[PDB]
Ligand binder design. Structure first.
Ligand SMILES: *[C@@H]1O[C@H](CO)[C@@H](O)[C@H](O)[C@H]1NC(C)=O
Ligand SMILES: *[C@@H]1O[C@H](CO)[C@@H](O)[C@H](O)[C@H]1NC(C)=O
Ligand SMILES: *[C@@H]1O[C@H](CO)[C@@H](O)[C@H](O)[C@H]1NC(C)=O
Lengths: 317, 208, 117
């Protein structure tokens, strides 16, 4: 339809070329399938759905900005709601297999599991644990004793709640915070606007409109002008598909990284420096976003220091 | 599982099939005219006068060259995908076969114990051996125990209660032990920790 | 001008098929179900959610179910579980198992060479 829309003679000439349309259709089908595999691999990592607990105050930690808000038509967190609000010829766009609601449901299940089971639910059955004890284990995971968390539990909960509020303000304030997703959308929009614009070119033909060639010229000449248009449109489709395959590979690499971060930082505590935020990693929380994922990385960062004299050992007896 | 379910090995078969299709497509393109009077170069040369044949042959040359470049381009992209897969396999080989990885779900579900490589046509199969909790019980807990006015915390474990006595266990396996001054450490008083529970702490030196 | 897709249980299961019109409204095209992914003809829609078998799109999947026919449904995402959050109790393993799983990765491509001449 792109090359020879509503033209029998053009289609008959297109059939003189090899299986280019078959290869192009297979490439685009393969890309669409890969995009659904990418979505499932990033979000569908846990096949058991955990319910949101009835409360938000887990040891003093306020999770109201990350957990779904049941009072809104869209069962999305305030942060997810912001993320969704900020991001906005023969051409068919297929829907995703997993809808935005299904992705939000997977994110919610991951948050509920993280809050009540820590990393346990991602590597075997889920085992309930009090949240301050989950944090105590996360502090031990970075070389800090349990007494630090319990003695400073109120301070830690307050810093956490303030940091989350800061995330909501930071995302709202900066237009570029979600630039990566808008850039992906804009690049694909440009690719399709260019592909459509290519249909208006002559490519050396007597006219860019196939129906004008058919009505103005006798078959012995019309076939020549049509063949010129076929060459131009086929080259344009091959260029488009090649660029889509390269972009698809880039997206696949991104999805693989997101899935790795999901399984290593949301379903566990990572010791890899700067893998999941700056500082010593404590925990992570996923959030759904259009065509992507947003990770909130909670880390421990030294705040104040004093200089002391030290020694490698003590000599006594 | 591998014997009875052939789809398990689909990842390797698809690579083989994709390359086979590309080669068959590449061969099939030789049968197309691309607008020429014939797909066979010898028919054009025998049927037409040289200056006419040159045009028909150049048309076939353009068609075949475009098909060959398309083949090479898709092979470069697929090869990049294979390279990424090989790099992941090498990373897993180095981190899980030659070591015990602490990365969650990097080498199997559960907590990683070990892995074993196996050769496969155009690829590698890893058998990942993991430790997975099977049975669980619910116990009452507390962040600390208050004894002589000081707060006791586990050194390497969690405090649990069985309804009448407090014990300290390892975190990944239920193994109750008497709570003693060797299993716990002391930091701070009983007033600061939220939810501290009063209990006896045994001193191994007092009987001796 | 939308595409036409054939949804089949497979030759070795049943010769019944459903036909999906990717973006054509059912008014323009008897088990006719209009979805966000197109007009699906031949599948019977049910309220029960099941694990996805043959994906259609926008959360809708189809499968061959019991008399026997193609059933269209909204896919289930997973099993339900109780989070059971408590501020004074912990679940601790008393027994364990050893699990062995399989991960399969491609390493190499068939080496080919094509003479341009
Ligand atoms: C959590 O914070 C929100 C504002 O960010 C507030 O409205 C809500 O009452 C808080 N909940 C608790 C339990 O502190
Ligand atoms: C707790 O364990 C101790 C030691 O085995 C035992 O004497 C006591 O009866 C147990 N209590 C309950 C409620 O099971
Ligand atoms: C633990 O589970 C295994 C399963 O193979 C079983 O054979 C064994 O008897 C169980 N032991 C206990 C103490 O539950």
């Amino acid at each position: 339809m792109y090359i020879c829309g509503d033209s029998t003679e053009c289609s008959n000439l297109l059939l003189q070329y090899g299986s280019f349309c078959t290869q192009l259709n297979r490439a685009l089908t393969g890309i669409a399938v890969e995009q659904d595999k990418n979505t499932q691999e990033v979000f569908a990592q846990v096949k058991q759905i955990y319910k949101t607990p009835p409360i938000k105050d887990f040891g003093g930690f306020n999770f109201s900005q990350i957990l779904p808000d049941p009072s809104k038509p869209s069962k999305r967190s305030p942060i997810e709601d912001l993320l969704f609000n900020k991001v906005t010829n023969g051409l068919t766009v297929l829907p995703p297999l997993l809808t935005d609601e299904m992705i939000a449901q997977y994110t919610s299940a991951l948050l509920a599991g993280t809050i009540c089971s820590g990393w346990t639910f991602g590597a075997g059955p889920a085992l309930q644990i009090p949240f301050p004890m989950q944090m105590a284990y996360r502090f031990n995971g970075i070389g800090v004793t349990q007494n630090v968390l319990y003695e400073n539990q109120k301070l830690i909960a307050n810093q956490f709640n303030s940091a989350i509020g800061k995330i909501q303000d930071s995302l709202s304030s900066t237009p570029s915070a979600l630039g990566k997703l808008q850039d992906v959308v804009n690049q694909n929009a440009q690719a399709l606007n260019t592909l459509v614009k290519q249909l208006s070119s002559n490519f050396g033909a007597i006219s860019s409109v196939l129906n004008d060639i058919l009505s103005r010229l006798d078959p012995p000449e019309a076939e020549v002008q049509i063949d010129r248009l076929i060459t131009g449109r086929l080259q344009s489709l091959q260029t488009y598909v090649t660029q889509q395959l390269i972009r698809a590979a880039e997206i696949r690499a991104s999805a693989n990284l997101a899935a790795t971060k999901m399984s290593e930082c949301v379903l566990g505590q990572s010791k890899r420096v700067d893998f999941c935020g700056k500082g010593y990693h404590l925990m992570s929380f996923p959030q759904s976003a259009p065509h992507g994922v947003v990770f909130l990385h909670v880390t421990y960062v030294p705040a104040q220091e004093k200089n002391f004299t030290t020694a490698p050992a003590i000599c006594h007896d | 599982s591998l014997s009875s379910t052939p789809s398990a090995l689909g990842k390797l078969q698809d690579v083989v099939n994709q390359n086979a299709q590309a080669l068959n497509t590449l061969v099939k393109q030789l049968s197309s005219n691309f607008g020429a009077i014939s797909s066979v170069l010898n028919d054009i040369l025998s049927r037409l006068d040289p200056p006419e044949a040159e045009v028909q042959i150049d048309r076939l040359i353009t068609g075949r060259l475009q098909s060959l470049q398309t083949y090479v381009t898709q092979q470069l992209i697929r090869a990049a995908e294979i390279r990424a897969s090989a790099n992941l396999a090498a990373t897993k080989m180095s981190e899980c076969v030659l070591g015990q990885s602490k990365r969650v779900d990097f080498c199997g579900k559960g907590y990683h114990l070990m892995s074993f490589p196996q050769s496969a046509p155009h690829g590698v199969v890893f058998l990942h051996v993991t430790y997975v909790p099977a049975q669980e019980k619910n116990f009452t807990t507390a962040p600390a125990i208050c004894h002589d006015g000081k707060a006791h915390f586990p050194r390497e474990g969690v405090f649990v209660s069985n309804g009448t006595h407090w014990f300290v266990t390892q975190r990944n396996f239920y193994e109750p032990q008497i709570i003693t001054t060797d299993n716990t450490f002391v930091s701070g008083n009983c007033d600061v920790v939220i939810g501290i529970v009063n209990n006896t702490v045994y001193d191994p030196l007092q009987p001796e | 001008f939308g595409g036409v897709s054939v949804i089949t249980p497979g030759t070795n299961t049943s010769n019944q098929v459903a036909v999906l019109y990717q973006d054509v409204n059912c008014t323009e095209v008897s088990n006719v179900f209009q979805t966000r992914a197109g007009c699906l003809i031949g599948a019977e829609h049910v309220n029960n959610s099941y694990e996805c078998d043959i994906p259609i799109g926008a959360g809708i999947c189809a499968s061959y179910q019991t008399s026997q026919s193609i059933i269209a449904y909204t896919m289930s995402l997973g099993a339900e579980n109780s989070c059971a959050y408590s501020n004074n109790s912990i679940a601790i393993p008393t027994n364990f198992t050893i699990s062995v799983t399989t991960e399969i990765l491609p390493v190499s491509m068939t080496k080919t060479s094509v003479d341009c001449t």
